Paper text:
Mammalian p97 (also called [name] or [name], cdc48 in yeast, and Ter94 in Drosophila) is a highly conserved AAA (ATPases associated with various cellular activities) protein with a homo-hexameric ring structure; each p97 subunit is composed of two AAA ATPase domains (D1 and D2) preceded by an N-terminal domain (N domain). [name], also known as [name], is a 21 kDa ER membrane protein. [name], together with Derlins, is thought to contribute to the association of the p97-Ufd1-Npl4 complex with the ER membrane, forming an ER membrane-associated module in ERAD. Here we show that [name] has an essential role in recruiting p97 to the ER membrane.
Taking advantage of the pathogenic p97 mutants that are able to achieve uniform subunit conformation in the presence of ATP analogs, we successfully obtained crystals of VIMPx in complex with two ND1p97 mutants (residues 1−460), each carrying a single pathogenic mutation either in the N-D1 linker region (L198W, ND1p97L198W) or in the D1 domain ([name], ND1p97A232E), in the presence of the non-hydrolyzable ATP analog AMP-PNP. The structural solution of ND1p97A232E alone allowed calculation of a difference Fourier map that revealed additional electron densities attributable to both AMP-PNP and VIMPx. For the first time, the AMP-PNP moiety bound at the D1 nucleotide-binding pocket was observed in a p97 crystal structure. The binding of AMP-PNP causes the N domain to move above the D1 ring, which was analogous but not identical to the Up-conformation previously observed in the presence of ATPγS (see Discussion section). To obtain an anchor point for sequence assignment of VIMPx in the complex, we also expressed and purified selenomethionine (SeMet)-derivatized VIMPx (SeMetVIMPx) for co-crystallization with ND1p97A232E. The anomalous difference Fourier map identified a large peak in the middle of the tubular VIMPx electron density, which was assigned to M89. Based on the position of M89, we built 33 residues (76−108) of VIMPx into the density, corresponding to helix H2 of VIMPx. (3) Binding between the two molecules is mediated by charged, H-bonding and hydrophobic interactions with a buried surface area of 759 Å2. (4) The orientation of VIMPx bound to p97 agrees with its topological position in the ER membrane, as the transmembrane helix immediately before the N-terminus of VIMPx would be in the open space above the hexameric p97 ring, where the lipid bilayer of the ER membrane would be located.
Residue numbers in the entry:
A (entry chain B): 76 to 108
B (entry chain A), C (entry chain A): 10 to 463
């Protein structure tokens, strides 16, 4: 129960960190061109 | 035509995706588009199984990415290495719902990544890396960890359960033991696969359909009501890649694979040659589905006229009995290779023995270019190097001649710098090393040296 | 002409009947017309002995049927399988008055018919099946029983008395023990017989008259005052079915049959080759009437010029002494086969050794069609497939070439579906499997591939 809540919490954490890095990369490319 | 290459063809299936470069270098994460995830019924954070090349798998967590094409999959270098794939390869993907929390795992560092450090590997590297991450891992994964301005590569040596698990807070992590040799991983990294074989597209298909397909799906053949042949003879002139294909098949197949080398059997004492032979067929029988590859067949089974030894003749008799002894339920296939097919005892090419033959012949110009690409992939080439042109100037060259061409080219390139380097130095000056490259001129030189040879 | 095929001919006798399909699938019942029963002096419910192929017998109960032709016999699938016969075959029938109540019998299930069930096999299957039925059965019968929405095949493993008996109320039925492998029965089911040999009608007659006839009726020959020859050499080019005939003879003969394989004798140590040879002729002598078949004779008895080994020459000497050693009372016949008759030591073809020769040659167009029918009988063929046409386009092909043609055809058929099937799947999609069939087009393709080969 609490195990799946932990996994889900870490998975949510993962998704938001990928989203943060997508935007950083996107910004870098705009500055490049 | 398209039919004889059927079996090589990339399938337009939803779980077949093209490998592209990753945004973010988290070793356990791979990124799809959201419509792709919707299609495969994958929700954010699901655990997935990837299949790459050379029997490789990786277990990852799948995440959404709006910059990712529907037909593409983003994965960092570490995952690609574990799958033995490069950017542009196609891999297959499925849910992995069965995957349990690990009881313990054993990992060790690569040796050239640690010389020397006091630090506790668990505390400094692994605990922060795994902490509350619930990362999936597989036996044989290599992964990279950052810590305190240093990076350390680890290999997963053991998991329990095997071969994969999720590393939880309560999973015991062992990091203790002798560091893994980099050279040993570089040996494994460079196993031969099908993508190391140029110019044989049609023959790789014939082999896949006479060997892999009937060991993998014996149902197909029973359904339609036919026995697949059990003896496949590869033939062709020297250096066309028969032995290469043997190594690829060994590293790609899902069957048990037993190599017999002609000369090596023939180098044994009287009676020990026979014994080893029997043991090979016994082991394969026992471990079916299985492939026996007999490389350089002509060594052990020349025409019973050629061979003026009673033992040598006895050995051929033994082979034939072993071939015939393959009762139809064994799922054992015997491949063999030779550059002298006419030199083989004809009784071996009868029905139920080596009854199929594959010509690994001289490649054509397009094939030669494939070969040149494969061979130079790890080489430092200058921009002036036009391999297509080299392909066009190498008529009648086979794979081995193209390898040597590339060696000779390189050596010329080295020759060009011999005014800076002495035999007597212990060391090579770095700016000399980093500038070293093979030019077209070097290849031109090599080419011209090869017209004496041919 | 009609005389050289005399011995194959179906006899217009009252006890020779054509197998037709059965009204009612009771495994112990067979149906004749009433005038046929009257003719053979069989009354309703008499116990009868049927002879089918491959030495098979069945014991049945004979019943009247007004829908049955006088010249026909109705029998369900189960009985036909036990007789190794198909619809349209001719079988022989006699009263069986000698047949005793069984003291015990042992039967076991086929394994793919039972995985898994609690139930007591006796109580749930066998007691209701045998109850007050007084069924006749024979060791080696396979029979099917219904019970509670499931069907279970059993094999009769033992009877007492052997080999047949009637199962009475007081007969002990054992059903306990390890289930019988389906694959093992499918191996037996597919033993080679004479009906698996196409295009050799005249040579099967020569063999039947030089081998079966004089071992079965040595009186004929003593009456008329002549010794039958004892050495029969089959010859012909590769793949014409010499070894096939050896397997058929082994599965059809009423004699003791001992196979010697050339290469396999020749694969033995010095002295062990000789020993095995002596033991073969000793065993046959002891177990007469008997057949020794020496397959690939040329391996053990090449011209005493060819063979540069003293042991190899010693072996041939041993053969000749063993052949001559067949004193005229032994009732042992030696057959042998070779695709190289000129390569055999000529002393073996002298009087009293291999003094009769049978040419298992290249079949003609009609023969080729017979072969194609035999080979495809268990294959999934589409309706467009015209084998007569294939027969006509395969001049100079022999049996083995026709087998491979049919394999290549099938493989093309499979090739056509390779867009749905992956090497990496564990499974084959069923609608793919059920639709799989070999088309004429597939055969056309195969044919065209075979004109390089020839
Ligand atoms: N088809 C190919 N594609 C790529 N490289 C090849 C190919 N064929 C040969 N080479 C290169 O040449 C090397 C020697 O070839 P090898 O696989 O030994 O050929 P082979 O046919 O086994 N020789 P032989 O046993 O002399 O008949 C290979 O290991 C490759 O480095
Ligand atoms: N007369 C035939 N009728 C039906 N099938 C045949 C016939 N001859 C050959 N075949 C098929 O081809 C296969 C190989 O033939 P086989 O019986 O080995 O011939 P063989 O003459 O013994 N060969 P060899 O020993 O090379 O001279 C058989 O097992 C059949 O599958
Ligand atoms: Mg080689
Ligand atoms: Mg044969």
């Amino acid at each position: 129960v609490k195990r799946q809540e932990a996994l889900a919490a870490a998975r949510l954490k993962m998704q938001e960190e990928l989203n943060a890095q997508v935007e950083k990369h996107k910004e870098k490319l705009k500055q490049l061109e | 035509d398209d039919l004889s290459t059927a079996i090589l063809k990339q399938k337009n299936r939803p779980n077949r995706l093209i490998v592209d470069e990753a945004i973010n270098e988290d070793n356990s994460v791979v990124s799809l588009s959201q419509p792709k995830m919707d299609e495969l019924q994958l929700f954010r954070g699901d655990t997935v199984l990837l299949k790459g090349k050379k029997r490789r798998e990786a277990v990852c967590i799948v995440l959404s990415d709006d910059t990712c094409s529907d037909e593409k999959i983003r994965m960092n270098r570490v995952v690609r290495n574990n799958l033995r794939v490069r950017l542009g390869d196609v891999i297959s993907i499925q849910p992995c719902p069965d995957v349990k929390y690990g009881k313990r795992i054993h990992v060790l560092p690569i040796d050239d990544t640690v010389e020397g450090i006091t630090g506790n590997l668990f505390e400094v590297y692994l605990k922060p890396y795994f902490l509350e991450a619930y990362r999936p891992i597989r036996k044989g994964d290599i992964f990279l960890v950052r810590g305190g301005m240093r990076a350390v590569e680890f290999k997963v040596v053991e998991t329990d359960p095997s071969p994969y698990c999720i590393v939880a807070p309560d999973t015991v992590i062992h990091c203790e033991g002798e560091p893994i040799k980099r050279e040993d991983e570089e040996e494994s990294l460079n196993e031969v696969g099908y993508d190391d074989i140029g110019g044989c597209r049609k023959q790789l298909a014939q082999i896949k359909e006479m060997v892999e397909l009937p060991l993998r799906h014996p149902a197909l053949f029973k359904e339609i009501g036919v026995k697949p042949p059990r003896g496949i003879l590869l033939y062709g002139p020297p250096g066309t890649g028969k032995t290469l294909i043997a190594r690829a098949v060994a590293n790609e197949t899902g069957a048990f694979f037993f190599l017999i080398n002609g000369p090596e059997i023939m180098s044994k004492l009287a009676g020990e040659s026979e014994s080893n032979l029997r043991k090979a067929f016994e082991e394969a029988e026992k471990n079916a589905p299985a492939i026996i590859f007999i490389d350089e067949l002509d060594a052990i089974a020349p025409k019973r006229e050629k061979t003026h030894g009673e033992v040598e003749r006895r050995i051929v008799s033994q082979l034939l009995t072993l071939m015939d002894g393959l009762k139809q339920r064994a799922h054992v296939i015997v491949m063999a290779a030779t550059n002298r097919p006419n030199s083989i005892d004809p009784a071996l090419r009868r029905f139920g023995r080596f009854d199929r033959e594959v010509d690994i012949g001289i490649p054509d110009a397009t094939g030669r270019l494939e070969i040149l690409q494969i061979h130079t992939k790890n080489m430092k080439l200058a921009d002036d190097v036009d391999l297509e042109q080299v392909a066009n100037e190498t008529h009648g060259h086979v794979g081995a001649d193209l390898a040597a061409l590339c060696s000779e080219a390189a050596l010329q390139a080295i020759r060009k710098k011999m005014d800076l380097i002495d035999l007597e130095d212990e060391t090579i000056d770095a700016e000399v090393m980093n500038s070293l490259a093979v030019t077209m001129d070097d290849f031109r030189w090599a080419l011209s040296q090869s017209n004496r040879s041919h």
